[PDB]
């Protein structure tokens, strides 16, 4: 009370949470207070000083919530699957307060329809289609998103992981929403957060770029992009341009770090996501790709010693002697269709592996960072070889 003539010593005490002891932040990132199943309830029981002169309030994702017990300092709450922000705010009668903030992880059951974020598919755009990846999602007849009931979910069979395709309503404004999966029976299951944005948001592929060659960037509303500026060099002509992807020619820049910005058609600034931080400026590392060798050279360790196609030599030691530690070697390889199997390995002249033997079925690019130890061993062991069977070396580059 305030009208009180005076406050007892115990009333004016600082608030302390004695038990339980909560973990400290990981490294700015919040710690986990609870890790329970969707069928179990969030159960935390506080002991607090002063005994009879403290009130505690609970917040799930910033929203105040009743403690499901007669006591106000024990919470009992049934939560849907997901990860939740929990705040524990303790206040005394004379207004002094202490605080705890942590995560509550609620795991689904095996048979539950469930979904987590794999890559960046939880960033969605109003009017457009989006994907959920998870388990048992063929059960879902509706998704609930910020008051809207999305009733057109389609479970797509894929060569990779299957997904639940759904359309975001146009009416939904920007922000973060906690989605819920609904059965035909009516049962509801948690599927964590979705982020709705109208912004042209570049998400991945924009950290690194090779000068004077194709550069593919992945985002959400990238068709609205009118131009990108790297260094001081503006690019307004693109090879591909869709919602999810844009490809351009990285301009002729010296090796180093550069600022990238962009402009939409409306004139607003292109946004960039890096570690769940959104900026209007992106740091791009540019490097030039040097060609060391070009052609079409078959490799088979079946062929006899002395045969030019038993290995890939053809890049002399003095070239590798010049390469600086940290550089990325790339070997572009293609299969021989008539070959029974396809295995390759990068090695020294002594056939010491610089990395694992790899088995493959399709054409590709093998990249490997050459450390100072690797470079030293190459000089010590008679140079560089590509070894294996049933493939061709078509290009070798370094940057």
Ligand X SMILES: OC[C@H]1O[C@@H](O[C@H]2[C@H](O)[C@@H](O)[C@H](O[C@H]3[C@H](O)[C@@H](O)[C@H](O[C@H]4[C@H](O)[C@@H](O)[C@H](O[C@H]5[C@H](O)[C@@H](O)[C@H](O)O[C@@H]5CO)O[C@@H]4CO)O[C@@H]3CO)O[C@@H]2CO)[C@H](O)[C@@H](O)[C@@H]1O
Cβ proximity to ligand X, 14 vs 357, nearer residue? 357
Residues in the chain: 399
The site partner of 318 among Na ion, ligand X, none (C-beta below 5 to 8 Å per kind) is: none
Residue 293 is encoded by which pair of tokens? 């060798």
Minimum distance from residue 1 beta carbon to Na ion (Å): 58
* Of positions 350, 359, 365, 372, contacts ligand X by CB under 6 A: 350
d(CA 281, CA 285): 13
Q: According to the binding rule CB under 6 A, does residue 351 interact with ligand X?
A: yes
Minimum distance from residue 158 beta carbon to Na ion (Å): 10
Decide if 193 contacts 253 (C-beta within 8 A). Answer: no
Candidates 48-56, 89-97, 299-307, 324-332; binding stretch for ligand X (CB under 6 A):
299-307
DSSP letter assigned to residue 211: T
- Near Na ion in 129-188, by CB under 5 A: 135
Short-list 286, 269, 267, CA closest to 278: 269
The site partner of 193 among Na ion, ligand X, none (C-beta below 5 to 8 Å per kind) is: none
6 class by beta-carbon count within 10 Å (0-12 exposed, 13-18 middle, 19+ buried): exposed
Candidates 73-81, 151-159, 203-211, 300-308; binding stretch for ligand X (CB under 6 A):
300-308
How many positions of this chain bind ligand X (CB under 6 A)?
A: 6
CA 172, 177, 183, 188 torsion-angle sign: negative
Minimum distance from residue 164 beta carbon to Na ion (Å): 10
- Near Na ion in 243-272, by CB under 5 A: none
Candidates 109-117, 278-286, 287-295, 297-305; binding stretch for ligand X (CB under 6 A):
297-305
> Which residues have CB under 8 Å from 21's CB, separation 6+?
none
Q: According to the binding rule CB under 6 A, does residue 302 interact with ligand X?
A: yes
Minimum distance from residue 298 beta carbon to ligand X (Å): 15
Cβ proximity to ligand X, 155 vs 301, nearer residue? 301
Decide if 290 contacts 268 (C-beta within 8 A). Answer: no
Binding mask 367-396 for ligand X (x = CB under 6 A): ---------------x--------------
User: Strand 82-92 and strand 54-60: pairing?
Assistant: antiparallel
| Torsion, Cα of 339, 343, 345, 350 (10° steps) | -70
HSE (side-chain half, CA atoms, 13 Å) at 172: 24
Cβ proximity to Na ion, 135 vs 210, nearer residue? 135
Residue 369 is encoded by which pair of tokens? 């960072």
Residue 132 is encoded by which pair of tokens? 């959920």
Q: According to the binding rule CB under 6 A, does residue 341 interact with ligand X?
A: no
Q: What share of the chain is helix, strand, coil (3-state, %, to 5)?
A: 5, 50, 45
Decide if 95 contacts 107 (C-beta within 8 A). Answer: no
* Of positions 43, 155, 254, 301, contacts ligand X by CB under 6 A: 301
Residue 134 is encoded by which pair of tokens? 């998870």
The site partner of 301 among ligand X, Na ion, none (C-beta below 5 to 8 Å per kind) is: ligand X
Candidates 51-59, 110-118, 127-135, 333-341; binding stretch for Na ion (CB under 5 A):
127-135
Residue 231 is encoded by which pair of tokens? 């260094």
If you write DSSP's letter for every residue of 59-76 in order, what string do you get?
A: EETTEEE--SSSSSSEEE
Q: According to the binding rule CB under 6 A, does residue 340 interact with ligand X?
A: no
The site partner of 302 among Na ion, ligand X, none (C-beta below 5 to 8 Å per kind) is: ligand X
* Of positions 305, 318, 340, 362, contacts ligand X by CB under 6 A: 305
Minimum distance from residue 366 beta carbon to ligand X (Å): 18
Q: According to the binding rule CB under 6 A, does residue 307 interact with ligand X?
A: no
Contact footprint for ligand X (CB under 6 A): 301-302, 305, 350-351, 382
The binding site for Na ion (CB under 5 A) comprises 135
């Amino acid at each position: 009370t305030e009208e009180e003539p005076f406050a007892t010593v115990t009333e004016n005490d600082d608030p302390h949470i004695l038990a339980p002891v909560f973990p400290d932040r990981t490294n700015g990132q919040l710690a986990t207070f609870a890790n329970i199943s969707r069928d179990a309830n969030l159960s935390i029981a506080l002991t607090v000083t002063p005994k009879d002169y403290t009130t505690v309030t609970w917040f799930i994702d910033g929203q105040e919530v009743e403690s499901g017990t007669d006591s106000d300092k024990e919470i009992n709450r049934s939560l849907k699957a997901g990860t939740y922000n929990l705040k524990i705010e303790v206040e005394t009668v004379k207004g002094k307060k202490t605080s705890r903030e942590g995560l509550v992880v609620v795991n689904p059951l095996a048979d539950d329809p469930q979904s987590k974020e794999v890559a960046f598919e939880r960033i969605v755009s109003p009017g457009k289609t989006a994907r959920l990846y998870g388990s048992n999602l063929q059960n879902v007849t509706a998704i609930l998103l910020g008051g809207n009931t999305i009733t057109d979910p389609t479970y797509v069979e894929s060569a990779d992981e299957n997904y639940l395709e759904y359309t975001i309503p146009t009416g939904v404004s920007e922000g973060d929403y906690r989605i819920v999966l609904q059965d035909a029976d009516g049962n509801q299951y948690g599927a964590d957060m979705v982020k709705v944005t109208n912004a042209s948001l570049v998400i991945s592929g924009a950290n690194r770029a090779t000068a004077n060659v194709d550069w593919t960037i992945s985002g959400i509303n990238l068709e609205n992009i009118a131009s990108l500026t790297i260094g001081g060099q503006t690019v307004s002509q693109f090879s591909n341009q869709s919602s999810t992807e844009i490809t351009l020619t990285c301009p002729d820049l010296s090796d180093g770090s550069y600022t990238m910005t962009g402009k939409t058609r409306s004139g607003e600034a292109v946004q960039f996501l890096n570690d769940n931080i959104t900026t209007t400026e992106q740091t791009v590392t540019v490097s030039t790709e040097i060609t060391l060798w070009s052609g079409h050279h078959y490799v088979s360790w079946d062929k006899p010693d002395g045969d030019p196609n038993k290995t890939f030599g053809l890049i002399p030691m003095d070239v590798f002697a010049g390469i600086t530690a940290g550089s990325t070697l790339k070997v572009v390889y293609s299969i021989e269709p008539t070959a029974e199997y396809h295995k390759m390995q990068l090695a020294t002249g002594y056939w010491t592996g610089l990395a694992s033997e790899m088995e493959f079925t399709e054409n590709g690019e093998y990249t490997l960072i050459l450390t100072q130890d690797m470079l030293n061993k190459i000089q010590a062991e008679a140079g560089f070889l590509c070894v294996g069977h049933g493939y061709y070396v078509d290009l070798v580059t370094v940057k």
